[PDB]
Amino acid sequence: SQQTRVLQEKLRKLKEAMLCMVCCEEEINSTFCPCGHTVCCESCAAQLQSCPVCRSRVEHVQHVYLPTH
Amino acid sequence: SQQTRVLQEKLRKLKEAMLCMVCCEEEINSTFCPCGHTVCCESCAAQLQSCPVCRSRVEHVQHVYLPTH
Ligand SMILES: C[C@H]1CNC[C@H](CO)C1
Ligand SMILES: [Zn+2]
Ligand SMILES: [Zn+2]
Ligand SMILES: [Zn+2]
Ligand SMILES: [Zn+2]
């Protein structure tokens, strides 16, 4: 039904929000510290000096294990 | 249709996976460091001395800003 299409769209958008903002291919699994922005996969987070969201210096990257992984 | 019920179940389970594993009421927004398990809201995370997934000591809690928030 049209309701099935609405639910498909909601699911698709939630799933896309869990993907890396740089490569758009891998799941987010890394946090920039200390700002806390958690928006990249490990590979894309590895060489950034500053956060791509807030420009704060990245002191280190914390790996995150999320139940949605 | 029956597919509407299946999609509602998939959406409900994905949303439940983003809720705190301890209180079941608030969104996950906190990481236990250094283990990386990201399974609690800020209120339950503040009250735990050991990670509820792996039992490692919590040195500190990092707030995470996720695009799914
Ligand atoms: C964003 C809320 C999540 N946990 C409850 C808190 C009450 O101030 C804040
Ligand atoms: Zn990436
Ligand atoms: Zn940031
Ligand atoms: Zn909680
Ligand atoms: Zn842990």
What is the overall silhouette of chain A? elongated
Chain oligomer state: homodimer
Bound molecules: [(3R,5R)-5-methylpiperidin-3-yl]methanol, zinc ion
Determine the CATH superfamily of chain A. Answer: Zinc/RING finger domain, C3HC4 (zinc finger)
| Estimated structural class of chain A | alpha+beta
- Can you list the strand order of the major beta sheet of chain A? 1-2
PDB class: ligase
Keywords: Diamond I04-1 fragment screening, PanDDA, XChemExplorer, E3, ubiquitin, Zinc finger, ring, ligase
Assembly: dimeric
Entry title: PanDDA analysis group deposition -- IDOL RING domain in complex with POB0041
What can you see in these coordinates?
2 copies of one chain form a homodimer. Chain A has a two-stranded antiparallel sheet with strand order 1-2. Chain A has one domain (2-63): Zinc/RING finger domain, C3HC4 (zinc finger) (Herpes Virus-1). Chain A has helices at 2-16, 42-46, and strands spanning 30-33, 60-63. With 69 residues, chain A is α+β, with helices and mostly antiparallel strands. The longest helix of chain A is centred in the first third of the chain and has 15 residues, at 2-16. Chain A has 2 helices and 2 strands; from the N terminus they run αβαβ. Helix content of chain A is 29%, strand content 12%. Chain A is elongated. The interface between A and B is medium-sized, with 29 and 29 residues. One zinc ion is lined by residues 32, 35, 37, 51, 53-54, 56 of chain A. Chains A, B: Homodimer. Interacts with the E2 ubiquitin-conjugating enzyme, UBE2D1 (via RING-type zinc finger). Interacts with myosin regulatory light chain (MRLC) and TMEM4. Chains A, B: A zinc finger (RING-type) spans 20-55. Chains A, B: It comes from Homo sapiens.
